[PDB]
Design a binder for this molecule. Structure first.
Ligand code: CLA
Ligand code: CLA
Ligand code: CLA
Ligand code: CLA
Ligand code: CLA
Ligand code: CLA
Ligand code: CLA
Ligand SMILES: CC1=C[C@H](O)CC(C)(C)[C@H]1/C=C/C(C)=C/C=C/C(C)=C/C=C/C=C(C)/C=C/C=C(C)/C=C/C1=C(C)C[C@H](O)CC1(C)C
Ligand SMILES: CC1=C[C@H](O)CC(C)(C)[C@H]1/C=C/C(C)=C/C=C/C(C)=C/C=C/C=C(C)/C=C/C=C(C)/C=C/C1=C(C)C[C@H](O)CC1(C)C
Ligand SMILES: CC1=C[C@H](O)CC(C)(C)[C@H]1/C=C/C(C)=C/C=C/C(C)=C/C=C/C=C(C)/C=C/C=C(C)/C=C/C1=C(C)C[C@H](O)CC1(C)C
Ligand SMILES: CC1=C(/C=C/C(C)=C/C=C/C(C)=C/C=C/C=C(C)/C=C/C=C(C)/C=C/C2=C(C)CCCC2(C)C)C(C)(C)CCC1
Lengths: 76, 217, 68, 76, 165, 61, 194, 192
């Protein structure tokens, strides 16, 4: 139920939904502590495949550590 | 001029017109802690505060401790006075310590902001009527007004003598309190008892014989 | 219990609260294709706010069914 | 870490195991007491009976979690 | 006590380990003469063993299920239960001596950079200047926080960096 | 540009002595592209203590 | 300028002097940027008004004899019926949560559709105390000072119940019974080593 | 100038002579600045008037035979009384009425800028409608108020020492003057 609700978040061809580049352009804090914030990162994740593979491998490696750590102690 | 060692060279930061006129200058900084003049100003203030509270504390040790060997004032030892006082008191010690932390924090923060700016606590409106008497007296660490009631600071020709008597009695009272602490740990008796033991047999009752201070003998 | 009252009331509440007070904010943040509703409250808006209504209604029914 | 291991090896070699630096892991044991383990005696938040989280989770999922976490025959 | 650890003066495996070490030392002792030098050495060993176990039981150390002293590294828990002399007082003692060494080295570097041969003073040590800074470095935390508050502790961005900074 | 013996600061980012201070030896007055000759008290990874720079790569600081 | 939170220190240049409640208090420099500062003015006035209502509600519950502010939602956990001034209220927790969500969503949404309205007037100001445009700033300063006092008082309610476990009027009764033997330092919670 | 607190001393240059009670007494130089000195004149006159009323109240309570000023709030720790006649209230209601009345009166007084001497409805008999004996009456007023402040601090210290009212300790001083004072006390002088 949580993933089916979460999969209705982004803007496809139906008018409603979040626009990811607008989300990245929004999250820039005042006082310039992150500089320009997350401006211009949508064209560096979507245009690059090694960035996407790095994010994917970071997530999958941490989740594989999670699989081992939770399957030895909580055997299903 | 006068020095803590006749013959040693005076450090260059304690031989300046801003340092020679302070109080009790004898060229004593072998660690070089006062080379920064802002640091020397801060350390002047810390020395004055340690001097004054050390004198008040050591007076509270000695005068009840001397008069208890006379007739009146059955006063316990200073390492036992807090326990007897909290048995006689009305509040537990944590509540009394919290009250004194608020009351001392207000006063100490006043003195803090007067260190950070000399012309600071004389803001009009900031105090009901004590705002005009909470300035300094052109020399920081030496306030006027309600502090110094008897007006002894007004006379200029006695003033370096008053400063130097204060700094000598204060440094000597700091040594007195550190001696109270060490004597308390090594012997276990009161400081007037230590003085009576050094007067009764000087050549046998001292820190070479207590078995603590130098244990290689 | 009364399932129809809870589901219909939650759906009516979320559809009204998206029809009247959260319509203009959702239009400002977003800036099938045409309905004759005077505020542009089209079919997909009905689907989203009714989905939230059914979800909160069945959540209320489940928490009531546990009696906790 | 290498210095503590070499220190304890020298203490075991010289015949005196009572000299070796054994630092107790009180932070992870604090976490285990926070999860409901009654061996370290901290008694807080899931290990104390008078806790809000203990009392709120008690009817539904805590009696299995406590029985499984206070067993020393599993890896939980 | 803390974490289910018994005190070492109450622990039984502690006394068992003490008795076992005395038993090994007396089994090594009983194959010599009375007043011989190996006998005197082993009796001094047994004396130091008994003194060490008495000193560890005296200091209030916590023993485990094996009879070995355990240390407590949390400031508030050790200050509450009287275990401050095993991590907390040692960590501030170490920070005093380590910052001593670092501050004396930093003052030696800044003292020798202002000459015509800084590297030649780095290879061949100026011993009087090194001893002067070694004696003056006892007020290193005060001088460290004063150099911190003036902005002279740090170099600005005149440092060496790479082309993407 | 800068004079002989004056201290300058290097703004060429792929240099060993970028954001550091050297001493001007000479400035060539011809149409050479890199006339400013700066020596440095420390050597690079190639053991060299001298490089040529342009006018907009040195700042007399 | 209303005053000075610490006498002798300078006021920050990003706090304008016309703004109500300006004591110059910003050590962490949180309001240095103007849009953030405008949002913080909005949020301070809103938090202050809700805290005045909360402290007034807690006092009016405990002085009139209906438990304290902590015992007030306890009918919804056990088997019980809600009350108000002794009069029973015939609603359940699901219905009340629905009424509160719809009504507060409508009111907060109408407030949020306005751009930067902090002091609206009009229908929210029927008696017309702010219809002078010269005596308004003194009332705004009174409002922000009572609001800051109410916020501090409500956080004191929360921390006093988290430490001792009683109502604020009962804590005031204990502090008037024995002021030296009943305070935050005779607690065992607020200072762990007393 | 009303006189001199210490003969031979000099008058401070910040105290004007057209001001009641100006004995030149300012060793700490507290009122050197005029806004501070204005606030202190206000505070001195208000403290003096409240102390006159308080001393007259404590004297009337003890002379008319209804305990002293220390026995008077003892019923609330345990039934009020006044002229020997009961008053049907409790300290919560009394504190409420007193807070409302003092808040209103104090607030109306504080709305005025620097008014020490209001007159008008506060002065029905019109004594200060001449501006010649009015300054003498102000001087009489500030001297009586200083005497009453000293009297009330004497009452507080005297009861903290002996544990008795002022009229009873006055009778003890009139009975045995060399055996009942602040020194047979055993508190004010800690020796002997
Ligand atoms: C902690 C109290 C204290 C403080 C803040 C000072 C501060 C000062 N002293 Mg004073 N002094 C003190 C106690 C103190 N003293 C005592 C007890 C004596 C008698 C032994 C003296 C005798 C003395 C002389 C003869 C002179 C000074 C001078 C000075 C000034 C310059 C020296 C300096 O920069 O070091 C700053 C000092 C400190 C920050 C003290 C703390 C040092 C470390 C942290 C602790 C040392 C522990 C110590 C060894 C005790 C063991 C326990 C400075 C204002 C010189 C001066 O010109 O005065 C105007 C000077 O000629 N002092
Ligand atoms: C403030 C000055 C002062 C004075 C007058 C005394 C006096 C005494 N000390 Mg104490 N003591 C002091 C400070 C002082 N101490 C300090 C700073 C420490 C820590 C180092 C101690 C630690 C200590 C121990 C462990 C013992 C004593 C003992 C004694 C007694 C025997 C004499 C002796 O061996 O002293 C020891 C002397 C010193 C430690 C050096 C004194 C330090 C000062 C600053 C030196 C300069 C003195 C000055 C030039 C002249 C004296 C001043 C005087 C006229 C006021 C004697 C009553 C013994 C005792 O209890 O007998 C019953 C004893 O066992 N003292
Ligand atoms: C390195 C990280 C670290 C961690 C994981 C811990 C862990 C702990 N600390 Mg320790 N502590 C630390 C460093 C740490 N400490 C440091 C650097 C200091 C000096 C500031 C302290 C000073 C300190 C005191 C004075 C006390 C503790 C206590 C504790 C225990 C419970 C604290 C709690 O419930 O709050 C959640 C944990 C944290 C927020 C981690 C930071 C801990 C802060 C600095 C102190 C928290 C104290 C807590 C508010 C008091 C709880 C009272 C208790 C009776 C319930 C817990 C084992 C308490 C204790 O003795 O319990 C038996 C206690 O009274 N610590
Ligand atoms: C949370 C509500 C809130 C908000 C949004 C503000 C916002 C503001 N205050 Mg106000 N203030 C508040 C509560 C708040 N205050 C309270 C309760 C008091 C009484 C203590 C004050 C006393 C005060 C003074 C004297 C002054 C201000 C001023 C200001 C303005 C500039 C300061 C700033 O940028 O900080 C923004 C504030 C926040 C971001 C609040 C959140 C703080 C952090 C994120 C968490 C703090 C948690 C807290 C410390 C936990 C306590 C735990 C407890 C157990 C100890 C800004 C409009 C200045 C002004 O010009 O008035 C208009 C000024 O002079 N405030
Ligand atoms: C809003 C002002 C306010 C007032 C009038 C009180 C009053 C009280 N508190 Mg509460 N409290 C407050 C804020 C306040 N508190 C805040 C902000 C906190 C979170 C830190 C607490 C957390 C707390 C705990 C944990 C406990 C109390 C307790 C008490 C009672 C005993 C006195 C005490 O030790 O307080 C504690 C004192 C402080 C927290 C410092 C107060 C400083 C304030 C916040 C600054 C403003 C005060 C202002 C300058 C002058 C007072 C104005 C006021 C008279 C109108 C007393 C009825 C105790 C109790 O239960 O008694 C039986 C107790 O155990 N308080
Ligand atoms: C109750 C508060 C009070 C206040 C606000 C004043 C204010 C004033 N007095 Mg008055 N005075 C008072 C009580 C007060 N007085 C009492 C009780 C006496 C009789 C002892 C006098 C006797 C007196 C004389 C003879 C003169 C003044 C004068 C003044 C004026 C200038 C002096 C000044 O600037 O100091 C400001 C004053 C204060 C800030 C008072 C506050 C109290 C301080 C902070 C603490 C005092 C504690 C006290 C000593 C405790 C005694 C305990 C005992 C056991 C020793 C100023 C209007 C001079 C004047 O020109 O008359 C108008 C003048 O010549 N006063
Ligand atoms: C206002 C003037 C005044 C008068 C007439 C009295 C009278 C008395 N006092 Mg009280 N008292 C006063 C002020 C006064 N006191 C003040 C200001 C304090 C706080 C310091 C006290 C604290 C006090 C204590 C602790 C005790 C008394 C006691 C007494 C009684 C015995 C005599 C004595 O020892 O006096 C006390 C002596 C002094 C206070 C020192 C004299 C200094 C005065 C105040 C200077 C002004 C006096 C003035 C020049 C002449 C009198 C003026 C008057 C006629 C208007 C006597 C009835 C004792 C008692 O109860 O007897 C059974 C007793 O134990 N008084
Ligand atoms: C100068 C210098 C410089 C160079 O550079 C270097 C060097 C040399 C290092 C330096 C030196 C230094 C030093 C020596 C220091 C010292 C200090 C001290 C001793 C202090 C004390 C100090 C001291 C102090 C404060 C004290 C105080 C005290 C008190 C309050 C007391 C109190 C009390 C009493 C009454 C009694 C009761 O029953 C209790 C009590 C509570 C206990
Ligand atoms: C300013 C600044 C600045 C700088 O820069 C920094 C710093 C310092 C950080 C800052 C500060 C801050 C602060 C202090 C804050 C605080 C706040 C608060 C307290 C809030 C509350 C707030 C609060 C609030 C709103 C509250 C509200 C309340 C309410 C509604 C209540 C309700 C209720 C009642 C009736 C009763 C019942 O039975 C229940 C209940 C339900 C419970
Ligand atoms: C002038 C000057 C200046 C320079 O510059 C410095 C110096 C010297 C510091 C200064 C001085 C000062 C002084 C001396 C002060 C004092 C004050 C006082 C005594 C007050 C009281 C004051 C006091 C007062 C008001 C009082 C009031 C009272 C009253 C109402 C009472 C009431 C009552 C009664 C009927 C009875 C009942 O059963 C109870 C009661 C409730 C108890
Ligand atoms: C026309 C018109 C009208 C009417 C309207 C109406 C009546 C509407 C309605 C509408 C509606 C009535 C809508 C609905 C919607 C709904 C929906 C869209 C739903 C969805 C659902 C969901 C999504 C679910 C899910 C789930 C499942 C399946 C399982 C369990 C879990 C959950 C719950 C999550 C009026 C009168 C106003 C006016 C005139 C015009």
């Amino acid at each position: 139920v949580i993933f089916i609700v979460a999969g209705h978040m982004y803007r496809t061809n139906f008018g409603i939904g979040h626009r990811m580049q607008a989300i990245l352009e929004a999250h820039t804090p005042p006082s310039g502590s992150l500089g320009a914030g997350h401006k211009g990162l949508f064209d560096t994740v979507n245009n690059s495949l090694h960035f996407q593979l790095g994010l994917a491998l970071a997530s999958v490696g941490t989740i594989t550590s999670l699989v081992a750590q939770h399957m030895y102690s909580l055997p299903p | 001029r006068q020095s803590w060692l006749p013959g040693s060279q005076i450090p260059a930061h304690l031989d300046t017109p801003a340092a020679q006129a302070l109080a009790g200058n004898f060229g004593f900084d072998p660690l070089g802690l006062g080379k920064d003049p802002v640091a020397l100003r801060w350390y002047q203030q810390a020395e004055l505060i340690h001097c004054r509270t050390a004198m008040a504390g050591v007076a509270g040790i000695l005068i009840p401790g001397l008069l208890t060997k006379a007739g009146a004032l059955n006063v316990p030892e200073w390492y036992d006075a807090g326990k007897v006082a909290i048995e006689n008191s009305f509040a537990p010690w944590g509540s009394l310590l919290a009250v004194q932390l608020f009351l001392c924090g207000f006063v100490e923060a006043k003195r803090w902001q007067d260190i950070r700016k000399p012309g600071s606590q004389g803001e009009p409106g900031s105090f009901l009527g004590f705002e005009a008497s909470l300035k300094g007296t052109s020399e920081l660490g030496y306030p006027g007004g309600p502090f110094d009631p008897l007006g002894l600071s007004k006379e200029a020709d006695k003033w370096a003598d008053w400063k130097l008597k204060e700094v000598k009695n204060g440094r000597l009272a700091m040594l007195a309190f550190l001696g109270f602490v060490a004597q308390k740990y090594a012997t276990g008796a009161g400081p007037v008892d230590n003085l009576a033991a050094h007067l009764k047999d000087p050549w046998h009752v001292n820190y070479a014989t207590n078995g603590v201070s130098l244990p290689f003998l | 219990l009364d399932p129809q009252i809870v589901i219909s009331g939650s759906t009516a509440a979320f559809l009204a609260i998206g029809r009247f007070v959260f319509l203009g904010y959702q239009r400002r943040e977003a800036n099938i294709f045409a309905t004759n509703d005077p505020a542009g409250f089209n079919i997909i808006d009905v689907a989203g706010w009714g989905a939230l209504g059914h979800a909160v209604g069945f959540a209320v029914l489940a928490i009531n069914s546990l009696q906790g | 870490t290498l210095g503590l291991y070499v220190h304890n090896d020298v203490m075991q070699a010289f015949g005196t195991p009572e000299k070796q630096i054994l630092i107790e892991p009180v932070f992870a044991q604090w976490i285990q007491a926070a999860h409901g383990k009654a061996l370290y005696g901290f008694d807080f938040l899931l290990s104390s009976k008078t806790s809000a989280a203990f009392a709120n989770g008690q009817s539904l999922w805590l009696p299995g979690w406590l029985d499984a976490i206070n067993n020393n025959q599993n890896s939980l | 006590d803390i974490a289910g650890l018994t005190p070492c003066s109450e622990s039984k495996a502690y006394a068992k380990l003490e008795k076992k070490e005395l038993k090994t030392l007396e089994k090594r002792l009983k194959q010599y003469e009375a007043d011989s030098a190996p006998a005197v050495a082993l009796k001094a060993t047994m004396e130091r063993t008994k003194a060490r176990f008495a000193n560890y039981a005296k200091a209030g150390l916590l023993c485990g299920n094996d009879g070995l002293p355990h240390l407590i590294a949390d400031p508030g828990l050790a200050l509450k239960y009287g275990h401050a002399g095993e991590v907390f007082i040692p960590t501030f003692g170490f920070l005093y001596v380590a910052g001593y060494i670092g501050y004396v080295g930093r003052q030696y570097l800044i003292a020798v950079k202002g000459e015509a041969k800084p590297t030649d003073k780095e290879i061949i040590i100026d011993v009087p200047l090194a001893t002067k800074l070694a004696w003056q470095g006892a007020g290193w935390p005060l001088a460290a926080v004063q150099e911190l508050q003036r902005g002279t502790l740090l170099e600005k961005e005149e440092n060496i960096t790479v082309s993407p900074r | 540009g800068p004079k002989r013996g004056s201290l300058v600061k290097i703004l060429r980012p792929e240099s060993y002595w970028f954001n550091q201070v050297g001493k001007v030896v000479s400035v060539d007055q011809s149409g050479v592209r890199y006339p400013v000759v700066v020596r440095f008290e420390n050597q690079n990874y190639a053991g060299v203590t001298t490089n040529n720079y342009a006018l907009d790569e040195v700042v007399a600081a | 300028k209303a005053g000075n939170w610490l006498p002798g220190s300078d006021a920050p240049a990003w706090l304008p002097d016309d703004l109500p409640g300006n004591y110059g208090f910003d050590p962490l420099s949180l309001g240095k940027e103007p849009a953030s500062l405008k949002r913080f003015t909005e949020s301070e006035v809103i938090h202050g008004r809700w805290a005045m209502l909360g402290v007034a509600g807690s006092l009016a519950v405990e002085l009139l004899g209906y438990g304290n502010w902590y015992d007030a939602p306890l009918w919804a956990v056990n088997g019980g019926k809600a009350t108000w001034f002794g009069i029973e209220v015939p609603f359940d927790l699901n219905a009340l949560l629905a009424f509160e969500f719809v009504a507060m969503a409508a009111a907060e949404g109408q407030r949020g559709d306005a751009g930067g309205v902090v002091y609206p007037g009009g229908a929210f100001d029927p008696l017309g105390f702010a219809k002078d445009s010269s005596k308004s700033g003194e009332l705004k300063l009174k409002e922000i000072k009572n609001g800051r006092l109410a916020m501090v008082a409500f956080l004191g309610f929360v921390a006093q119940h988290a430490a001792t476990g009683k109502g604020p009027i009962a804590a005031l009764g204990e502090h008037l019974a024995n002021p030296w033997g009943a305070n935050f330092a005779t607690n065992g919670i607020s200072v762990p080593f007393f």
